[PDB]
């Protein structure tokens, strides 16, 4: 047992297979995957050379995301259950046709570092299995973890597939996967999983993991679902360490990797301008200590409305119709409600920028586009233009700094993720805090202009 460790995550500019009309050969698939593994090896060795205990690499980092069932097939391997007790590097012939697992095992062993990666699983089946797909096998999006001896210690099949992941199957039941180390208990899940209850919430609530490792290939959607923004907020809301390893592909708005602790981001990377990968390291506590449990409706339910006779308007945020009120002065106090959710904001801007409009919004309803999930959100955000019809649209930059803010709401859930995002998609580590009574508030003037301050709530039972 050790009290701290060094975490590493790598943002990877993947080598994508070329567009072809029919499946490539096993041999071609393996040659491509090995070209990606050559680059990941560079990151793994560099991290180990700086004393890292664990490194995470991204979802689809080894073969990309452009597949149907058949074009994916040659990239797949049969990945056994870790209960078999297998070190591929030391016993390479135990299960045949497993060169990717072998190389990952050797990378972990030779650099004595835990290695988290995402590859593809195939599970052959018969018609005797009533669930067996017509084409004779299951295909899974699969995280694998190898320990510092090269032993396979975790295998996780992605539960919540994103629209367009037609090449993979959904597992029969959600797989709750953990692995224990000398530097804490770890849980694992993948990209889209972060928006759902199973396995993500269960790992924290039932299995009490200290840290999440998180391969992802996330497409950023402002104002609330940029990777570094939402991932760091989830970590703070769930009170776990969080190691997010993302694909680097600006063409599809993929960039946003980091290492996040319960109180704050520790390192983050965002880059839409280059095609470079990036390795991040940071120290973390093996067993983070926590403050008291946050009651998200406590302060909000205790006060009278901060404003009345609001001039309210409708605005669209990522396809959801929020109820907004405009912030008129350089300082103010507003309350706005939609159905069961009332949202309260107190603020003071550093300067009124005349052509820049900010609004406070509330949403309480079911999201349906690109996925189905129930939301309660209170948001302060920079409107894209001066027109109120653009409040909620994607806004990349702003000029208004804030001297103070305090946001809260009457949430009917205890799963709330506190987000703060500054202009140019920068996080604000150490500049804000969450109180026990559910207030997201500033500790000092913001170091840069504000894109949003948001409390993003999930009511999993209403999905
Ligand atoms: C209404 O908003 C104002 C900000 O414009 C709040 O003012 C307080 O400002 C002082 C600065 O001297 C801070 O110390 C406090 O932190 C601010 N408010 C807090 C903590 O609530 C004012 O309090 C707001 N009204 C409320 C909350 O009823
Ligand atoms: C990944 O699961 C995609 C998840 N989708 C997003 O990042 C999406 O932009 C939001 C933020 C969840 C909004 O709906 C993996 C993936 C990557 C590429 C293609 C398909 C799936
Ligand atoms: C894709 O084709 C280009 C051009 O011939 C080639 O340089 C590259 O190596 C190819 N990649 C793969 C995976 O075949
Ligand atoms: C592991 O190191 C040994 C050194 O002899 C060698 O067999 C192999 O090339 C190495 N593999 C990796 C992936 O580092
Ligand atoms: C949270 O606070 C509200 C209002 O103060 C109270 O009614 C509720 O019982 C509290 N819930 C928990 C779980 O502490």
Short mmCIF file of C-alpha atoms in Angstrom, two decimals, residues 154-427:
data_model
loop_
_atom_site.label_atom_id
_atom_site.label_comp_id
_atom_site.label_asym_id
_atom_site.label_seq_id
_atom_site.Cartn_x
_atom_site.Cartn_y
_atom_site.Cartn_z
CA UNK A 154 -9.63 -6.44 -16.54
CA UNK A 155 -11.84 -6.82 -19.59
CA UNK A 156 -14.86 -4.53 -20.10
CA UNK A 157 -17.38 -4.72 -22.97
CA UNK A 158 -18.93 -1.29 -23.67
CA UNK A 159 -22.55 -1.20 -22.46
CA UNK A 160 -23.88 2.04 -23.92
CA UNK A 161 -23.15 2.12 -27.64
CA UNK A 162 -23.41 5.45 -29.43
CA UNK A 163 -25.55 5.84 -32.56
CA UNK A 164 -23.44 4.66 -35.52
CA UNK A 165 -21.63 1.89 -33.56
CA UNK A 166 -23.47 -0.74 -35.63
CA UNK A 167 -20.27 -2.86 -35.77
CA UNK A 168 -20.59 -3.89 -32.07
CA UNK A 169 -23.05 -5.86 -29.90
CA UNK A 170 -24.50 -4.83 -26.55
CA UNK A 171 -23.62 -7.24 -23.74
CA UNK A 172 -26.40 -9.37 -22.20
CA UNK A 173 -26.10 -7.66 -18.82
CA UNK A 174 -24.07 -4.61 -17.74
CA UNK A 175 -20.52 -5.63 -16.84
CA UNK A 176 -19.30 -4.16 -13.55
CA UNK A 177 -15.52 -4.31 -13.86
CA UNK A 178 -12.95 -3.34 -11.26
CA UNK A 179 -9.31 -4.09 -10.55
CA UNK A 180 -7.43 -3.54 -7.28
CA UNK A 181 -3.89 -2.20 -6.97
CA UNK A 182 -1.44 -1.00 -4.33
CA UNK A 183 -2.52 2.57 -5.25
CA UNK A 184 -6.28 2.17 -4.96
CA UNK A 185 -9.35 0.39 -6.27
CA UNK A 186 -10.12 1.12 -9.93
CA UNK A 187 -13.33 1.06 -11.96
CA UNK A 188 -13.56 1.21 -15.77
CA UNK A 189 -15.99 2.31 -18.47
CA UNK A 190 -15.99 3.86 -21.95
CA UNK A 191 -16.99 7.18 -23.56
CA UNK A 192 -20.83 7.36 -23.79
CA UNK A 193 -21.14 5.18 -20.65
CA UNK A 194 -20.46 8.35 -18.59
CA UNK A 195 -24.02 9.59 -19.28
CA UNK A 196 -25.70 6.46 -17.91
CA UNK A 197 -26.26 4.59 -14.65
CA UNK A 198 -24.86 1.17 -15.62
CA UNK A 199 -22.00 0.55 -15.03
CA UNK A 200 -20.72 4.07 -14.22
CA UNK A 201 -22.80 5.02 -11.16
CA UNK A 202 -22.81 1.47 -9.77
CA UNK A 203 -19.01 1.37 -9.72
CA UNK A 204 -18.97 4.40 -7.40
CA UNK A 205 -22.10 3.79 -5.35
CA UNK A 206 -21.91 0.01 -4.83
CA UNK A 207 -18.22 -0.84 -5.39
CA UNK A 208 -16.66 2.29 -3.82
CA UNK A 209 -13.88 2.68 -6.39
CA UNK A 210 -11.25 5.35 -5.77
CA UNK A 211 -10.43 6.04 -9.43
CA UNK A 212 -11.98 5.65 -12.88
CA UNK A 213 -9.92 4.94 -16.01
CA UNK A 214 -11.74 6.23 -19.08
CA UNK A 215 -10.77 5.58 -22.69
CA UNK A 216 -12.90 7.79 -24.90
CA UNK A 217 -13.45 9.02 -28.45
CA UNK A 218 -15.70 11.95 -27.57
CA UNK A 219 -17.13 14.49 -30.01
CA UNK A 220 -17.36 17.84 -28.22
CA UNK A 221 -20.80 19.49 -28.04
CA UNK A 222 -20.92 22.92 -26.35
CA UNK A 223 -22.13 24.45 -24.06
CA UNK A 224 -22.33 21.47 -21.64
CA UNK A 225 -20.74 18.41 -23.27
CA UNK A 226 -17.19 19.31 -24.16
CA UNK A 227 -14.95 16.48 -22.95
CA UNK A 228 -12.67 18.21 -20.44
CA UNK A 229 -15.70 20.12 -19.14
CA UNK A 230 -18.12 17.25 -18.53
CA UNK A 231 -15.55 14.61 -17.56
CA UNK A 232 -13.91 16.77 -14.88
CA UNK A 233 -17.40 17.69 -13.58
CA UNK A 234 -18.46 14.04 -13.33
CA UNK A 235 -15.35 13.30 -11.31
CA UNK A 236 -16.15 16.20 -8.91
CA UNK A 237 -19.79 15.21 -8.61
CA UNK A 238 -19.02 11.51 -8.02
CA UNK A 239 -15.93 12.29 -5.88
CA UNK A 240 -13.44 10.04 -7.66
CA UNK A 241 -10.15 10.40 -9.47
CA UNK A 242 -10.74 10.24 -13.22
CA UNK A 243 -8.22 9.50 -15.99
CA UNK A 244 -9.66 10.54 -19.38
CA UNK A 245 -7.79 9.49 -22.54
CA UNK A 246 -9.29 10.90 -25.74
CA UNK A 247 -8.75 10.61 -29.48
CA UNK A 248 -7.15 13.60 -31.18
CA UNK A 249 -9.15 14.34 -34.35
CA UNK A 250 -10.23 17.99 -34.73
CA UNK A 251 -12.06 17.06 -37.94
CA UNK A 252 -14.80 15.49 -35.77
CA UNK A 253 -14.31 17.75 -32.71
CA UNK A 254 -12.34 15.09 -30.84
CA UNK A 255 -9.91 16.58 -28.31
CA UNK A 256 -10.04 16.78 -24.53
CA UNK A 257 -7.93 14.61 -22.25
CA UNK A 258 -7.07 15.02 -18.61
CA UNK A 259 -6.46 13.80 -15.10
CA UNK A 260 -9.13 14.93 -12.67
CA UNK A 261 -9.40 14.69 -8.86
CA UNK A 262 -12.49 15.19 -6.66
CA UNK A 263 -11.66 18.82 -5.74
CA UNK A 264 -10.20 19.95 -9.05
CA UNK A 265 -8.74 19.17 -12.44
CA UNK A 266 -5.01 18.33 -12.14
CA UNK A 267 -4.11 18.40 -15.83
CA UNK A 268 -6.09 18.91 -19.02
CA UNK A 269 -5.41 19.25 -22.73
CA UNK A 270 -7.55 20.77 -25.49
CA UNK A 271 -6.29 21.41 -29.02
CA UNK A 272 -8.31 22.02 -32.19
CA UNK A 273 -5.35 23.59 -34.04
CA UNK A 274 -2.68 20.87 -34.51
CA UNK A 275 -2.64 17.17 -35.34
CA UNK A 276 -0.28 16.43 -32.42
CA UNK A 277 -0.83 13.84 -29.69
CA UNK A 278 -0.20 14.71 -26.04
CA UNK A 279 1.00 12.90 -22.91
CA UNK A 280 -0.17 14.27 -19.54
CA UNK A 281 1.10 13.24 -16.09
CA UNK A 282 0.07 14.19 -12.57
CA UNK A 283 0.24 12.93 -8.99
CA UNK A 284 -2.99 11.73 -7.39
CA UNK A 285 -4.02 10.35 -3.99
CA UNK A 286 -4.62 6.61 -3.89
CA UNK A 287 -7.63 7.02 -1.59
CA UNK A 288 -9.03 10.51 -1.90
CA UNK A 289 -10.56 11.96 1.28
CA UNK A 290 -13.94 13.64 0.80
CA UNK A 291 -15.89 16.49 2.38
CA UNK A 292 -19.50 15.99 3.49
CA UNK A 293 -22.18 14.70 1.09
CA UNK A 294 -23.64 17.51 -1.00
CA UNK A 295 -27.39 18.10 -0.70
CA UNK A 296 -28.08 19.72 -4.08
CA UNK A 297 -31.57 21.09 -3.20
CA UNK A 298 -30.73 22.36 0.34
CA UNK A 299 -29.92 26.06 -0.08
CA UNK A 300 -32.10 26.37 -3.18
CA UNK A 301 -35.26 25.15 -1.41
CA UNK A 302 -34.59 27.42 1.59
CA UNK A 303 -34.84 30.86 -0.08
CA UNK A 304 -37.44 33.07 -1.72
CA UNK A 305 -37.16 33.78 -5.47
CA UNK A 306 -34.33 36.24 -6.11
CA UNK A 307 -36.34 37.96 -8.85
CA UNK A 308 -39.96 38.17 -9.99
CA UNK A 309 -41.91 39.37 -13.01
CA UNK A 310 -39.18 37.84 -15.17
CA UNK A 311 -39.16 38.53 -18.87
CA UNK A 312 -38.67 34.90 -19.93
CA UNK A 313 -37.96 33.34 -23.31
CA UNK A 314 -37.41 29.91 -24.87
CA UNK A 315 -33.98 28.81 -26.07
CA UNK A 316 -32.57 25.60 -27.50
CA UNK A 317 -29.53 23.91 -25.91
CA UNK A 318 -28.43 20.73 -27.69
CA UNK A 319 -32.02 20.13 -28.91
CA UNK A 320 -33.63 20.73 -25.47
CA UNK A 321 -35.98 23.67 -24.85
CA UNK A 322 -34.74 25.67 -21.86
CA UNK A 323 -36.60 28.49 -20.09
CA UNK A 324 -34.25 31.49 -20.03
CA UNK A 325 -34.05 34.90 -18.42
CA UNK A 326 -31.56 37.51 -19.65
CA UNK A 327 -29.00 39.03 -17.27
CA UNK A 328 -29.56 42.80 -17.59
CA UNK A 329 -27.01 44.47 -15.28
CA UNK A 330 -23.30 44.12 -14.47
CA UNK A 331 -24.54 42.70 -11.14
CA UNK A 332 -27.75 40.90 -10.23
CA UNK A 333 -29.75 38.11 -8.66
CA UNK A 334 -32.16 35.99 -10.72
CA UNK A 335 -34.43 32.99 -10.32
CA UNK A 336 -35.95 31.06 -13.21
CA UNK A 337 -37.97 27.84 -13.22
CA UNK A 338 -39.11 25.09 -15.51
CA UNK A 339 -41.55 22.55 -14.03
CA UNK A 340 -40.02 21.08 -10.84
CA UNK A 341 -36.67 22.87 -11.19
CA UNK A 342 -36.01 26.43 -10.01
CA UNK A 343 -32.52 27.83 -10.64
CA UNK A 344 -30.94 30.69 -8.66
CA UNK A 345 -27.97 32.85 -9.69
CA UNK A 346 -26.14 35.68 -7.95
CA UNK A 347 -23.36 37.31 -9.95
CA UNK A 348 -21.11 40.25 -10.58
CA UNK A 349 -19.33 40.76 -13.89
CA UNK A 350 -15.90 42.39 -13.94
CA UNK A 351 -17.02 44.61 -16.81
CA UNK A 352 -20.13 44.89 -18.98
CA UNK A 353 -19.12 44.05 -22.53
CA UNK A 354 -21.93 45.81 -24.46
CA UNK A 355 -22.26 43.37 -27.39
CA UNK A 356 -22.13 40.27 -25.16
CA UNK A 357 -25.27 38.75 -23.68
CA UNK A 358 -25.49 36.24 -20.82
CA UNK A 359 -28.59 34.29 -19.76
CA UNK A 360 -29.69 32.00 -16.94
CA UNK A 361 -31.63 28.91 -17.96
CA UNK A 362 -33.50 25.95 -16.53
CA UNK A 363 -34.41 22.61 -18.09
CA UNK A 364 -36.36 19.71 -16.58
CA UNK A 365 -37.20 17.05 -19.12
CA UNK A 366 -36.29 14.10 -21.28
CA UNK A 367 -33.47 14.41 -23.81
CA UNK A 368 -34.02 12.28 -26.94
CA UNK A 369 -31.62 13.32 -29.76
CA UNK A 370 -28.57 11.02 -30.18
CA UNK A 371 -29.69 9.21 -27.02
CA UNK A 372 -32.38 8.98 -24.37
CA UNK A 373 -31.81 10.39 -20.86
CA UNK A 374 -33.61 12.60 -18.33
CA UNK A 375 -32.00 15.91 -17.41
CA UNK A 376 -32.27 18.69 -14.86
CA UNK A 377 -29.91 21.56 -15.68
CA UNK A 378 -29.34 25.04 -14.30
CA UNK A 379 -27.03 27.05 -16.52
CA UNK A 380 -25.43 30.44 -16.76
CA UNK A 381 -24.14 30.79 -20.30
CA UNK A 382 -22.76 33.17 -22.87
CA UNK A 383 -25.23 33.53 -25.74
CA UNK A 384 -23.59 33.01 -29.15
CA UNK A 385 -24.66 36.43 -30.52
CA UNK A 386 -26.63 39.44 -29.21
CA UNK A 387 -29.85 37.72 -30.29
CA UNK A 388 -31.69 35.81 -27.58
CA UNK A 389 -32.59 33.09 -30.09
CA UNK A 390 -28.90 32.05 -30.00
CA UNK A 391 -28.76 31.55 -26.21
CA UNK A 392 -27.80 27.88 -25.95
CA UNK A 393 -25.96 27.68 -29.29
CA UNK A 394 -22.33 26.55 -29.36
CA UNK A 395 -20.08 29.45 -28.32
CA UNK A 396 -16.29 29.05 -28.43
CA UNK A 397 -15.09 32.43 -27.14
CA UNK A 398 -16.11 35.24 -24.83
CA UNK A 399 -14.72 38.41 -23.22
CA UNK A 400 -16.73 38.86 -20.02
CA UNK A 401 -14.90 37.87 -16.83
CA UNK A 402 -16.83 37.45 -13.55
CA UNK A 403 -15.81 38.81 -10.15
CA UNK A 404 -18.27 36.46 -8.46
CA UNK A 405 -20.92 33.88 -9.17
CA UNK A 406 -23.09 31.51 -7.19
CA UNK A 407 -25.41 29.00 -8.87
CA UNK A 408 -27.87 26.55 -7.31
CA UNK A 409 -31.17 24.79 -8.01
CA UNK A 410 -34.00 22.68 -6.54
CA UNK A 411 -32.70 19.43 -8.00
CA UNK A 412 -34.80 16.28 -7.62
CA UNK A 413 -31.64 14.15 -7.87
CA UNK A 414 -28.38 13.81 -5.94
CA UNK A 415 -26.39 13.15 -9.15
CA UNK A 416 -25.30 16.62 -10.21
CA UNK A 417 -22.11 17.50 -12.06
CA UNK A 418 -20.68 20.99 -11.59
CA UNK A 419 -19.25 22.53 -14.76
CA UNK A 420 -17.17 25.64 -15.30
CA UNK A 421 -15.73 26.43 -18.71
CA UNK A 422 -13.75 29.46 -19.76
CA UNK A 423 -13.20 30.99 -23.21
CA UNK A 424 -11.20 28.79 -25.62
CA UNK A 425 -12.47 25.70 -23.79
CA UNK A 426 -10.21 26.11 -20.71
CA UNK A 427 -11.02 24.65 -17.29
#
